[PDB]
Each structure stands twice: as structure tokens, then as C-alpha cells.
Amino acid sequence: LAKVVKFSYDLYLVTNGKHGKRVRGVWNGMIGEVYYKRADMAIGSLTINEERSEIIDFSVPFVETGISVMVSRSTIGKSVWLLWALVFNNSVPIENPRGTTSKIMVLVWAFFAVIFLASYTANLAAFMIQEQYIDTVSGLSDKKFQRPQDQYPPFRFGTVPNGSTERNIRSNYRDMHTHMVKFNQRSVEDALTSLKMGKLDAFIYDAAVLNYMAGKDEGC
Amino acid sequence: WNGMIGEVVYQRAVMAVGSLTINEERSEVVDFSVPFVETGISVMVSRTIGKAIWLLWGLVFNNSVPVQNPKGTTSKIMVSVWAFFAVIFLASYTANLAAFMIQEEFVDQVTGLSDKKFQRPHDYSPPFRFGTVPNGSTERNIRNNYPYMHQYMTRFNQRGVEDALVSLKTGKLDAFIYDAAVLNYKAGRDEGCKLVTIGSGYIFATTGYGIALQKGSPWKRQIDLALLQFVGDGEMEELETLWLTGICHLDIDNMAGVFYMLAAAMALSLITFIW
Amino acid sequence: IVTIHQEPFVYVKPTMSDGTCKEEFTVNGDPVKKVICTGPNDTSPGSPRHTVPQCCYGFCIDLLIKLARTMNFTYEVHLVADGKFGTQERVNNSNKKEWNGMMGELLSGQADMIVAPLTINNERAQYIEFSKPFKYQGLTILVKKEIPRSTLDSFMQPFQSTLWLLVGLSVHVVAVMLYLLDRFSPTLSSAMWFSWGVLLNFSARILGMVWAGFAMIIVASYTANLAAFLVLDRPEERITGINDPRLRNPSDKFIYATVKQSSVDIYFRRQVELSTMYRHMEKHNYESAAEAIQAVRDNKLHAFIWDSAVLEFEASQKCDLVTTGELFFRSGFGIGMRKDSPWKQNVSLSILKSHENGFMEDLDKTWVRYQEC
Amino acid sequence: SAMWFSWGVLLNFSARILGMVWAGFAMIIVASYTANLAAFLVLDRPEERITGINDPRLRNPSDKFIYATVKQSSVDIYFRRQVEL
Amino acid sequence: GMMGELLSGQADMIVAPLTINNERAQYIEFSKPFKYQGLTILVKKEIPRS
Amino acid sequence: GELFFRSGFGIGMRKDSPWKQNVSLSILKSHENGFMEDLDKTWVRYQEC
């Protein structure tokens, strides 16, 4: 941007807080820096929402991020008996068919039995190769996230506060927020460690950051 | 001299930038820059002890042919162990075959210009035909190296690269010997590449394309340094990716072994007819 | 308001008697909100240009109704005269360049807002101002499922390379030699039964052993080939994404195209390394997305390059069509307006608010995520 | 008696029927184990190291991947001069 | 190294696999390359499993 | 398989020198005939285990 728009920039990073939050009418973070005319613009991983767009002017988005959930991916009619014995081809001594039709259907049924065994083995192999998408939850609209107290089994989800995700959840789902606040977490790396060791089940955070963390994870 | 070399020598042009190969006779009359793409010459072509053995060995494959029954407790235990080992061996063999077939790979060919067929194809009853285009570095090199090969090539002389490609595709020609970079590009951009180059071009001159400047021209040092600068910054790879890409960047031995084994078994059976 | 006929976003249907359509209901019981749009008839070049009031509904119409509810204004919806979104085209008078389609109608004052799946890009943004994107999606390729279909019951095992005739000749020879050997050795029915059942049940023993081993290894290879076939083998000549040689190396055998005077056309024109694709596509670029989709269904086409949000919906509706999972040039659908205008900030804020809550998710469920398979 | 037959059923009134259905169970479980192991020894294959120089592991150094060249050579100059490496 | 030996007069030629690059070519003179080759990565990517 | 920074092994020499042109001419001539191929086959293409 500096090359194209032909401007020179003075770069610094804010220590007043996280990306942005309004505490008692006073903004903090990069949003506070831009809003109070202490900086001309902010370049970090800053999310666009209605609350921030009301006070400042956002540019066009240059990478798509929503909110996402990360998990740890933790002598005729009695021939049926002989026919079924040959289905498992156990060579059970019972009798001997003598007719041409008898021999033909015996051979056809032996061929059918062997191909049925082969198809079963192949089907099991193909099923084992395929990887089922074993997902803990369908998404946020899931019943677990909404009312964990109203359901007997508990499960743990949390986020990093003072972010866009916390504001979104506060505005939308109040019971979910009240359950999530007591399970609050400090950092993204701390949340990943907690997910790895099992202290937490689901981590709700930014889509791009979680995608990058999943991509470069050790152990996949 | 005619062509780009003629233009450069006779001071009509300061330098030539086209696909110009570096060799000795041209270097005697013009100054060449460092090569910026490696092009040799390559070839394009078209695509109870005595009776227990049978009982045990038949018990390996669970053929269920009633013969007799073991008596020893140790014998029974070892029979169960050996039959189970046979079963797991079959399971592992099936798994190995599945892994083998699910694995896939491709073939290639190397040979060389000095192959017997390339020297004199008269040994092959239908004499396979190969040819070049004249007015080129490849034709001059082949004339200087093997006059007999050039004399044979004269019977299949032709003009264009696309003409050679269509002749190979239609079966009117067998092997096309030509500049390595051009043949590599054609192989890359051939639809399905029914045409393939013999390995990489490394057999003959394996020189490179250069900027042919006038003899003693002051631009030589600057051009060489600029080209090496482009090579060092990776811009050369960027240009190559922009301009030179392409698409292409049931048993014999085992079946013969099985056939030999069954034939030998039958033959030994027939021989043992007397005793 | 000016808009265009795009099936997932703007359905356009004829009226029943006079400025009214059938009062449809969603499967969830919520009535469908339809609006009256005055637009031209089906055929543009071969039919007279007379406007008729049809009725439009869909994703974009619901979004427009929500906008009018939030930002207090009334609307008069009409369709764009030609079925073009809008590009900068050379006019054959004065050697100038001008905007056509919805872009031209908006810039000329004929409309005050473009509520349609209008792609945001730098070419259009230099003359009009977009809102924050109300959709995120890229370009993708629409194809079909196999030439006609996939095989049902795997043709009872394709028996790839059966060489079955030679195998049967070998078993016939072995059976004949078995009968000869047994007759020589110190029993037609017994030998025939043994020959058939040997697969399952001095020299006869060894012949039995070798035959059992050979049939055993044959069945092992057969099981392995079936398993390999039904674990991996399934694509037969797919144009996997845009990187396939069929599109990278163009030929008249394989035909792919896009919609003329659209965003995809100028996207392919702008790029330098896709000039071959642009030349191969410009010959037979279609007038509208529906016509190109029908041509793909009728085999006049082989691949269609278009926005993912439309092609994925069409693949969901039509089971005989499919789309590759690839994506390129991810972009967004926003709402176009003129230069600095009073509605711009509130439109952007309303779209952001709808994104924050589930309204856009509700629209996706109602119009895009409702599939039949 | 029939106890050994049981052990041997895998290979060799209504008691015979029960033995037959049990033999069928034995065959189906052996086939299941065969398919399981066949998928097991096919799916596990660590390619890890990617042939590319564009592999992310090379671009992002870590403890588990150590790579270097000869000191004071042409590769040293090549990696020094390019600012994106 | 070898470049310093050649430039300081201790040697008159460098007959060795000396890679041609822009930095060295500013001071010394290279012949037409006698071996065309690029860079590559060697690994012990061999897993004696099974 | 990804061969990056394609370059060449050549013979180093000082600035303008009597043996500058003839070394390059001799190397080119050896490339024209099979001498370089002979050396490659003798010392490089000797594939062993």
C-alpha cells in the first residue's frame, strides 16, 4: 500500500489493550488509537463489525474471517441346508446332487458365495480407508452450546475476551455467554495447549487465526 | 553467414535475442553472453512320516480333503499353529497385493543417439526413419560427428517443428532429433502427450541459448552481469513458470514364473508316471 | 432499484391476472415475500422491447425488503434492459468507452441502487461505491457426473483385464488331462464332480495341490483387484478444477465458457497468463448464466466458469450436474450505489448488522441451503 | 470329540447347524480382520519431507527440522542475496 | 578460499566445480560452463519400516 | 526433484588473460563431440549400489 498509494509510514504497536473494546464509553486498543486521533490508521488483524464501523471508517476487507470452533478430534426341499452350508463353503458332508441343474446352481452359488466374501472384504477395506467427519457439534446453533445447563452432560467451551467474538456472542446468545465467561482463557496458544491437554473441549475464535493454527499444528 | 548470425556479424544488428544456440563456429565470429536456458539435442518419439508331507501342505491352503488325523498332542498343537500361520500368511499376501495395486508409477526410456538402430537401422527389417531440420546447429553437429547418420537423415529431411510433430503423430516418422528446449516445450504442451522426449536432453552439446553480440562489443560484460543477476534473483524461474510448463512434466515376469512353475509341476507329474 | 435475473438470488415469474403472483409458502410455513418488477420479456434480440410487469423474489429481494424496513424508504424495482451485469465496452461512435448493463443504468441516473449479485472489483469501484459485501464467494467450474452416469453395481465387477477365455481354456485342458490321468491310473462322474468342486470341495495329489494353489492365488488377486477398484478407482477423466490439462491446454474438443459482459470476463481479460483461456472463451461466451447452464446440461458445453454461490446452488438442485471443489479469485457480492450518497453508510451498517446476527444465515437457509437430492 | 472340531472348524442334529453358523461367524470375523489389516498397512505412509523448496517446513525453521549448506559457498551467497529467503 | 587464491596471484586457474554467479563474475572471468546443473536437497528420507 | 537456481560449473580465471578465449572454445568443442559425455559416463554415470 505504501508503494502504490505513495506514502511513508511510521509503524508502532499499541500497548493500551487488545484489538478494541469500549469500557464505560472509552475505547482501548487500536480502535481507541484511531478514534482519538492518536494514529492515522490501523493495520493489524482487525475485524469489521457494526460497533466499530459506527465510530471509524473501515476499508474493504482483504481477508475473510468469521468465527469458528476448534476441537481436539479425539429330497428336494431340504437342499437349502446344503446350499447355505456351501454359502460358507465349509465342505460339510451332507449329500451329493446328481442333476445337471443341481450342478449348475451349485457352481453358480459357489461363485456367488466367493464373490460375496470378496465384496464384503473390499467393502470393509474401502470403509476403513474413508475418514468420517466425526464432529463434536454441528456448529453454534447446536443444542450443546445453547443450554449446557439444561442438558445433563457438561462440556467445556471458551474464548479469548475483549474481542469481536465476545461482543458477537454477548449481543446474540446470553446463556451461552454466561456459561462461557466462567471458562475464560487468556491467549490463543494457551487455548491450544488447554485443548491439547484436555482442559477444554471447544475453542471459539477467529476463522483465519484458527485456520492458520490448525494448518501448522504439530501432529495434525 | 546468413540469419541472425549474419545480421550480427555484418553490423546490421547490435545483438540477437532469439533462440540462438552456442557452439564453437559461431563463437569464432560473434561474442556470446552467458547461457540463460540449457538446450542440448534430444529425441522425440511416440508413446505316516512319508505321507505327512502332502497332508500338511494340503492343510496349508484349507482345501478340506479328508486323509487322516494326527495323534500327538505336540503334533496337534504344531499343526494348529502352522495352519494359523498359513491363514495369516494368506491375509498378509492379500494385503500386500492390495497395497501393490493401489500403488502407481510410470515408465520412461534412456537409450542414446549411439544406439545400434540410430547408427544403422538396416538391421531392423522395416528401417525406422529419423530426421532433423536443416540450417540448424543440430544438423551441423550431426554432420561433424557422424557423416553416415547425416547421409541417412537426408532421406527424411523436413522443414517445420509442427510438421515433425504431425508426422510423428500420424506414423509418418519414428524419431525426431531436435533442440532440447523446443522438444521439451512441445512434449509439455501436447494434448495428452502421445509424444515423449527420451529422458532429459544431455547426450550431445548440451549448450545453452545466448545473446549473440558483435565481436568485441562493449555490451558483453553488462549483458552477462545482468543475466547472472536475473538468475540469482529467481526471476529466471518465474519466467520459466510463466512460459515453459505443460501437462506431463497386467504382469509379465510373475505370470511367466507362474506358467513355468505349473508347467514344471505337470512335467514332473508326467515323468513320475512310471514310478 | 435495478436488478438482474439470477436464479438463486432473483427469481422472476409472470403475474397471474394483474400485478399479482400466487401467494407461495415456504415449507416452514413462512410466506414468500414477492415484489413487482417491470422488466422486458424473454428474448432480447429477436423479440420487441416492450416492458411487462412480472414479479421477482429471492435472496436479494428479501435483503432489499429488510433494508427498506430498517432504513425507511420505498422502492420501485425494475429489471435491467439487457441481461448484462456491466462492463466498460467500446462504443462504435467517437471511439469512446462506456458502461452498459446495470452499471450503465446506475451511472446514467436510471436507477439509485443495484440490489443484485454484483461482484466488487477495482474496475467498477472507480466509478461507483459498493457497500460492505453481503456475500463471500469465489469463481468455480460446473460440470456433469460422468459422461452419462456412474456404473450401478459396478457392472457386477468390471473384471478389468479378465483374460477369462484363456483361463477357461486352461481349466478345460487341466480337466481333460485329469480325466485321462485318472482313467490311466489303476469314474466319469467322480472326476467331473472333482473337476467342478476342486475350488471348494501318486500324481493326483500333487496335481490337486498345484491346482488348489493356483486357484487360491487367482482368487487372492481377484479380491485385491475388487478392493483396489472400489477404494480408489472412481474418477474416469474428470476435469478436476481449473488446473486440468483440458482447460490449461485448450482445444476445440473441450468447450468451456462464461457469461459475456460479466465480472468473470473482465477477470480473465485482465490476467496476463490466462490470455489463452480468454481467447478460447471469447468465441462462444453465453448471454446469460441460465443459458450456459442449460447448454452444459445439453452437452453443447463442457464446463462453465461462474460465481460459486450460483453454481453450487445449481448443482444442488440438478443432480446430473456437479461442481469441482476448487476456488479461485475469492470475492464478494455487495450493493452498488452512485458516488457519495446519503444511503451508503446506513446500507453498509445494516448489512454488517445482518451479518452479526443470523439474518444472513436465515436467508442462506431459506434460499441457498435448501437442496433436493 | 466335537470340541476339537470347533477349534478346527476354521480349517478342518442341530448341534451341526450351530457349528455351521459358528463357522460362518468365524469366516466373517477372519475376513473382517483381513480387511482391517489391509487398510492398516496401506494407509500408513509418512511422506513428511516434501520434495519442494517451497515446502513450509523449510520456509519456517523449527527444532524438528534442521537443514544447512556448506559455509562460504555459492549456496550461502544465493540465500544471502534474496531478501524473501 | 579459492576465489581469494586466484585473485591474490597464488593461482592462475580454478579447475574445480566452481558455480558461476553474479558476485564472482564481477572480479574473475568464467569460461563457458562445462557442467550444467542446479541446486537440490538431499535427505535421509528412507523409512525401513515393516 | 525441484531443481532451483540452475547454473553451471565453469573454469575460473582472472581478468583479461591469454587463456580466456581458448579455454571457452576448447570446452565448447569438447561439448560438441562426446568428450564431456565420455567423462560423464566414466565418472558420474557409473551407477552402483
Ligand SMILES: *[C@@H]1O[C@H](CO)[C@@H](O[C@@H]2O[C@H](CO)[C@@H](O[C@H]3O[C@H](CO)[C@@H](O)[C@H](O)[C@@H]3O)[C@H](O)[C@H]2NC(C)=O)[C@H](O)[C@H]1NC(C)=O
Ligand atoms: C479484558 O479486559 C479486561 C478489562 O476490560 C481485563 O481485566 C483487567 O485485567 C488486568 C490484568 O489482566 C487487571 O489488572 C490487575 O493486574 C495488574 C498487574 O499489574 C494490577 O496492577 C491491577 O491492579 C489488577 O490487579 C485489571 O484490574 C482488569 N480490569 C478489569 C476492569 O477487569 C482483562 O485482563 C482483559 N483480558 C484479556 C486481555 O485477555
Ligand SMILES: *[C@@H]1O[C@H](CO)[C@@H](O[C@@H]2O[C@H](CO)[C@@H](O)[C@H](O)[C@H]2NC(C)=O)[C@H](O)[C@H]1NC(C)=O
Ligand atoms: C536450408 O537451407 C537451404 C539453402 O538455402 C534451403 O534451400 C532453399 O529452399 C528454398 C525453398 O525450398 C528454395 O527456394 C531455395 O532455392 C533453396 N536454396 C538453395 C541454395 O537451393 C532450405 O529450404 C533450408 N531449409 C529450411 C528448413 O530452412
Ligand SMILES: *[C@@H]1O[C@H](CO)[C@@H](O[C@@H]2O[C@H](CO)[C@@H](O)[C@H](O)[C@H]2NC(C)=O)[C@H](O)[C@H]1NC(C)=O
Ligand atoms: C417512516 O415512514 C413513515 C411513513 O409512514 C414516514 O412518515 C411520513 O413522514 C413524512 C415526513 O417525514 C410525512 O410527509 C408523511 O405524511 C408521513 N407519512 C405517514 C403517513 O406517516 C416517516 O417520516 C418515516 N420515518 C422517517 C424517515 O423519519
Ligand SMILES: *[C@@H]1O[C@H](CO)[C@@H](O[C@@H]2O[C@H](CO)[C@@H](O)[C@H](O)[C@H]2NC(C)=O)[C@H](O)[C@H]1NC(C)=O
Ligand atoms: C442514517 O442513519 C442515521 C442513524 O443514526 C440517521 O441519523 C438520524 O436520523 C434521524 C432522522 O429522523 C434523526 O432524527 C436523528 O437525529 C439522526 N441521528 C444522527 C446521529 O444522525 C440518518 O438520518 C440516516 N440517513 C439516511 C439517509 O437515512
Ligand SMILES: *[C@@H]1O[C@H](CO)[C@@H](O)[C@H](O)[C@H]1NC(C)=O
Ligand atoms: C413477452 O414477449 C414474447 C415474445 O412475443 C411473448 O411470447 C410473451 O408472451 C410476452 N410475455 C408477456 C407476459 O406478454
Ligand SMILES: *[C@@H]1O[C@H](CO)[C@@H](O)[C@H](O)[C@H]1NC(C)=O
Ligand atoms: C453501434 O452503436 C450503436 C449505438 O451507438 C448500436 O445501436 C449498434 O448496435 C452498434 N453496432 C454494432 C455493435 O455492431
Ligand SMILES: *[C@@H]1O[C@H](CO)[C@@H](O)[C@H](O)[C@H]1NC(C)=O
Ligand atoms: C589461442 O589459440 C590460437 C589459435 O586458435 C593461438 O594462436 C593462440 O596462441 C592461443 N592463445 C592461447 C594463450 O592459448
Ligand SMILES: N[C@@H](CCC(=O)O)C(=O)O
Ligand atoms: N482480530 C480479532 C481477534 C479475534 C477475536 O476477537 O475473536 C478482533 O479484532 O477482534
Ligand SMILES: N[C@@H](CCC(=O)O)C(=O)O
Ligand atoms: N536453436 C537451434 C535450432 C534448432 C536446432 O537445429 O537445434 C539453432 O540455433 O541452430
